[PDB]
Design a protein around this ligand. Structure first.
Ligand SMILES: Nc1ccn([C@H]2C[C@H](O)[C@@H](COP(=O)(O)OP(=O)(O)OP(=O)(O)O)O2)c(=O)n1
Ligand SMILES: *CC[C@H](OP(*)(=O)O)[C@H](O)COP(=O)(O)O
Ligand SMILES: [Ca+2]
Ligand SMILES: [Ca+2]
Ligand SMILES: [Ca+2]
Ligand SMILES: [Cl-]
Ligand SMILES: [Cl-]
Ligand code: NA
Ligand code: NA
Length: 323
DNA sequence: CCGACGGCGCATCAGC
DNA sequence: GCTGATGCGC
DNA sequence: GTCGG
């Protein structure tokens, strides 16, 4: 399969266990970070001591890598795999809206399967019912050809509402992925900027038009700057797809498109590197950290590249932000 | 030893 | 009613 | 779980 695939699968399994079963989010993030650095390491790891040189691999992961390399398994993961209760909780978190807390609450009350959830819809919130309704569709990848049909509809329909909107498809699509988990749309309008005195009421109008033409079929969440929902290409029916729309102040487009292009791991790595250089980056601003350790005033951003320059990173094209 | 760990929008929960 | 914490996801 | 202070 892959160089060190044994080790990174083992760390991913541990990560998922800590997140889904232990609800130990720091251990989850630790395992995820080690899995990522090892997956990038361009050599066959022969010992835990070799892995321990990598940033994010410590004593405990070195010891697991030693057990895994010597035995071809981890007894801890043997046991977790034996554990029906860990398995039920892991499975239920695959429903959109079910996290570790809901999954444990359900398994505690004997609700372990998709069938058990369908029998107990009164115990689900809206997001979970939609996640359940489209469980299969939401795990199917969107071929780039369909992403292009979807982009055509979104850009066409947004222009119908107001010719001044600019819609940009972000996420894996903007990084040039041949398939995407979902569709991420960044939206700007000239009347919505960082200096706007009142809450924008723009997103509702775009969501309404996409609902009116039956492209958007369901709503998971809706506020003034974020919509999360479900959409479907018109036709055998196409699968229902997740769609996220983010309305970002027009003058903060560079920070917005950097965030919304990802990847998630790239973003986490870039923001961590910013912190070590004395900056904090969010979807809106890059701010310097002062002596008191707190974010100062937003810095001028006149390009996507300016953000990289502040933290002294070589510019990466969207295609080079994947994992 | 210690606290930090990327940063945030929305829905729901929990408590006054 | 309200405000803030937690859950979940981007 | 790992790191930096
Ligand atoms: N934990 C996360 C998740 C996401 N994002 C940002 C970067 C992502 O690229 C973007 C959209 O999130 P998705 O989960 O849709 O990620 P992708 O579009 O990269 O992947 P996929 O093909 O799974 O949709 O949001 C982030 O900063 N942190
Ligand atoms: C992988 C080994 C673990 O590292 P972490 O601090 O999760 C622990 O050493 C296992 O110890 P336990 O929590 O006592 O099982
Ligand atoms: Ca190390
Ligand atoms: Ca889930
Ligand atoms: Ca995406
Ligand atoms: Cl933890
Ligand atoms: Cl963490
Ligand atoms: Na780590
Ligand atoms: Na998304």
């Amino acid at each position: 399969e892959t160089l060190n695939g044994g080790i990174t699968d083992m760390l991913t399994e541990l990560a998922n266990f800590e997140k889904n079963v232990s609800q130990a989010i720091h251990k989850y993030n630790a395992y995820r970070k080690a899995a990522s650095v090892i997956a990038k390491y361009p050599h066959k790891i022969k010992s835990g001591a070799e892995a321990k040189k990598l940033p994010g691999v410590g004593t405990k992961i070195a010891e697991k890598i030693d057990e895994f390399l010597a035995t071809g398994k981890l007894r801890k993961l043997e046991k977790i795999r034996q554990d029906d209760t860990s398995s039920s909780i892991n499975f239920l978190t695959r429903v959109s809206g079910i996290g570790p807390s809901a999954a444990r609450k359900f398994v505690d009350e004997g609700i372990k399967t998709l069938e058990d959830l369908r029998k107990n819809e009164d115990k689900l919130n809206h997001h979970q019912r939609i996640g359940l309704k489209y469980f299969g569709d939401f795990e199917k990848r969107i071929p780039r050809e369909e992403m292009l049909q979807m982009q055509d509809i979104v850009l066409n329909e947004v222009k119908k509402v107001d010719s001044e909107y600019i819609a940009t498809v972000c996420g894996s699509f903007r990084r040039g992925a041949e398939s995407s988990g979902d569709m991420d749309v960044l939206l700007t309008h000239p009347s919505f900027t960082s200096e706007s005195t009142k809450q924008p009421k723009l997103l509702h109008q775009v969501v309404e038009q996409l609902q009116k033409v039956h492209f958007i079929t369901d709503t998971l969440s809706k506020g003034e700057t974020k919509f999360m929902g479900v959409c479907q290409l018109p036709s055998k029916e196409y699968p229902h797809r997740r769609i996220d729309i983010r309305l970002i102040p027009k003058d903060q487009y560079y920070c917005g498109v950097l965030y919304f292009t990802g990847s998630d791991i790239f973003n986490k790595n870039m923001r961590a590197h910013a912190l070590e250089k004395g900056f904090t980056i969010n979807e809106y601003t890059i701010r310097p950290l002062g002596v008191t350790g707190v974010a100062g005033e937003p810095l001028p951003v006149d390009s996507e590249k300016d953000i990289f320059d502040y933290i002294q990173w070589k510019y990466r094209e969207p295609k080079d932000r994947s994992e």
